Design an enzyme around this catalytic site. Structure first.
Site, PDB file in Angstrom:
ATOM      1  N   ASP A  73      60.793  88.759  62.101  1.00 27.68           N
ATOM      2  CA  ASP A  73      60.456  88.536  63.445  1.00 27.68           C
ATOM      3  C   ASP A  73      59.378  89.467  63.904  1.00 27.68           C
ATOM      4  O   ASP A  73      59.454  90.094  65.056  1.00 27.68           O
ATOM      5  CB  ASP A  73      61.678  88.492  64.284  1.00 27.68           C
ATOM      6  CG  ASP A  73      61.290  88.063  65.896  1.00 27.68           C
ATOM      7  OD1 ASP A  73      60.256  87.145  65.972  1.00 27.68           O
ATOM      8  OD2 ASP A  73      61.948  88.597  66.960  1.00 27.68           O
ATOM      9  N   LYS A 103      56.168  91.053  66.026  1.00 28.71           N
ATOM     10  CA  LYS A 103      55.515  90.470  67.005  1.00 28.71           C
ATOM     11  C   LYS A 103      55.232  91.878  68.109  1.00 28.71           C
ATOM     12  O   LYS A 103      55.573  92.799  67.569  1.00 28.71           O
ATOM     13  CB  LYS A 103      56.164  89.325  67.772  1.00 28.71           C
ATOM     14  CG  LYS A 103      57.756  89.699  68.370  1.00 28.71           C
ATOM     15  CD  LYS A 103      58.205  88.579  69.107  1.00 28.71           C
ATOM     16  CE  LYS A 103      59.534  88.916  69.133  1.00 28.71           C
ATOM     17  NZ  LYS A 103      60.109  87.721  70.003  1.00 28.71           N
ATOM     18  N   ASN A 146      58.137  93.380  69.699  1.00 32.55           N
ATOM     19  CA  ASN A 146      58.922  94.456  68.639  1.00 32.55           C
ATOM     20  C   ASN A 146      58.225  95.554  67.788  1.00 32.55           C
ATOM     21  O   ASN A 146      58.993  96.316  67.444  1.00 32.55           O
ATOM     22  CB  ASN A 146      59.717  93.420  67.611  1.00 32.55           C
ATOM     23  CG  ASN A 146      60.554  92.495  68.129  1.00 32.55           C
ATOM     24  OD1 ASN A 146      60.989  92.604  69.153  1.00 32.55           O
ATOM     25  ND2 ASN A 146      61.096  91.583  67.109  1.00 32.55           N
TER      26      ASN A 146
END
Ligand SMILES: [Mn+2]
Lengths: 323, 10
Positions: free
Chosen positions: A131, A133, A136
Site C-alpha cells: 500500500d 502512497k 503513508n
C-alpha cells in the site's frame, strides 16, 4: 505492563474508518508518540482483525530508520492501542498538496529512503508492503521518510512467491493486481514508480474519478511524461511503471538491487542512506513536539479526551520494545 | 492536488 494511564492525550492527529490517532506524551519519560486507538467492537464488526494483527506482527518484527517503529502495543477490555514513533512532519500527501511538484533532487532523496526501507522489508523480512502512497509516507521532524500503516502487508513472501488478495489503494494498484492473476513483490516497485511520478510530475500517472475507468487507464494507457523531466528520471519512472512485472525494474531475483544500480541514483551510497547521512532537502518547520501544522486542521482543532465475540481478548497482543 | 485516497482489501 503498559496501560492508558501512562500517557497524556494532547491532540487528534487524524481519524480513519476503524479508529483514531492521538498525539500522546508518556508520563514517566516525557517522550511523545502517536497512539492508534481501535475500538475492538469496530474491528470485529468490519472484519478488520486480521489486518490489525498483521500490523502488530510486522511492526514487532521490524526496525529500520525509515519505518515507523512500535514502542508499545497493549489492550484494554474494549480497545486496542499501538504506541508508535510520532512523525512530526506529517504526510508527503499534505506537502505535495501545497507544493505542486518537488525537484528531481528532492524526489531522489525520498526515493532513496523508500528504497532502503522496501529493500529491508523484502530481503530481510520477506514482507511485501502493498500500500505505498503519499498518505503513508510521513516525515519525521528532521525530514526523513517514515513509512506507516502495515495492516496490508503480506508476511512470508520469498523470491517470486505469488499473492492473490485484491487490496491496496485504487489509484496505486499495479496492473498485475488489477489483472487478478497472481502477483509478486514487484507490486511495491510499481507503487514506488507512482509515488515518484507524483513527486516529480505533480499528478498521478493515470487518473479518472471512476475506478473502473481508472483501472482501464492503468492496464491499457502508455505512460507519458512532462517534457521537462530529465532523462534519468524518465528512465527510472519508465522501468518502475512497466505493466509486465517481469520487465519491471526490480522485478527479477535481484529485486531492490536493480533499482539501487539505476543511473538516477548514481553516486548515492546506500549505507550512508541507511545511516541518515543524506541532507534532507526540506526540514519541517516545527517549533516543538506539539506543533501539528503539517496535519489536517479538520482533526487538529478538536479537543477530546475519553481515557465474548463482540469484545474479545486478543491473546499475546501486548508488546514492549527495546529488544 | 488529487483528492485524498483510501485503501481496501477483498
Ligand atoms: Mn493510514
Amino acid at each position: 505492563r503498559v496501560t492508558m494511564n501512562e500517557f497524556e492525550y494532547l491532540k487528534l492527529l487524524g481519524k480513519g474508518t476503524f479508529g483514531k490517532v492521538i498525539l500522546v506524551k508518556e508520563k514517566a519519560t516525557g517522550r511523545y508518540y502517536a497512539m492508534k486507538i481501535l475500538k475492538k467492537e469496530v474491528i470485529v464488526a468490519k472484519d478488520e482483525v486480521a489486518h490489525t494483527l498483521t500490523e502488530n506482527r510486522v511492526l514487532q518484527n521490524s526496525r529500520h530508520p525509515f519505518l515507523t517503529a512500535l514502542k508499545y502495543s497493549f489492550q484494554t477490555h474494549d480497545r486496542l492501542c499501538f504506541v508508535m514513533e510520532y512523525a512530526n512532519g506529517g504526510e508527503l500527501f499534505f506537502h505535495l498538496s501545497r507544493e505542486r511538484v518537488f525537484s528531481e533532487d528532492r524526489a531522489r532523496f525520498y526515493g532513496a529512503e523508500i528504497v532502503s526501507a522496501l529493500d529491508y522489508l523484502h530481503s530481510e523480512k520477506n514482507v511485501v508492503y502493498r500500500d505505498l502512497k503519499l498518505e503513508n509516507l510521513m516525515l519525521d521532524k528532521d525530514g526523513h521518510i517514515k513509512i506507516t500503516d502495515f495492516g496490508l502487508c503480506k508476511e512470508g513472501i520469498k523470491d517470486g512467491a505469488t499473492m492473490k488478495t485484491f487490496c491496496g489503494t485504487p489509484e496505486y494498484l499495479a496492473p498485475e493486481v488489477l489483472e487478478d492473476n497472481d502477483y509478486g513483490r514487484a507490486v511495491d516497485w510499481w507503487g514506488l514508480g507512482v509515488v515518484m511520478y507524483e513527486m516529480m510530475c505533480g499528478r498521478l500517472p493515470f487518473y479518472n474519478q471512476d475506478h473502473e475507468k481508472l483501472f482501464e487507464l492503468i492496464l491499457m494507457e502508455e505512460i507519458r511524461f512532462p517534457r521537462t523531466l530529465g532523462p534519468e528520471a524518465k528512465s527510472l519512472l519508465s522501468g518502475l511503471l512497466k505493466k509486465d512485472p517481469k520487465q519491471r525494474l526490480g522485478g527479477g531475483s535481484e529485486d531492490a538491487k536493480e533499482i539501487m544500480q539505476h543511473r538516477f541514483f548514481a553516486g548515492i551510497v546506500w549505507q550512508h542512506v541507511y545511516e541518515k547521512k543524506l541532507s534532507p532537502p526540506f526540514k519541517p518547520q516545527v517549533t516543538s513536539e506539539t506543533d501539528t501544522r503539517y496535519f489536517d486542521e479538520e482533526f487538529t482543532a478538536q479537543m477530546i479526551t475519553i481515557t465474548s465475540e463482540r469484545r474479545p481478548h486478543f491473546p499475546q497482543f501486548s508488546y514492549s520494545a527495546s529488544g | 492536488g488529487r483528492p485524498r485516497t483510501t485503501x481496501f482489501a477483498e
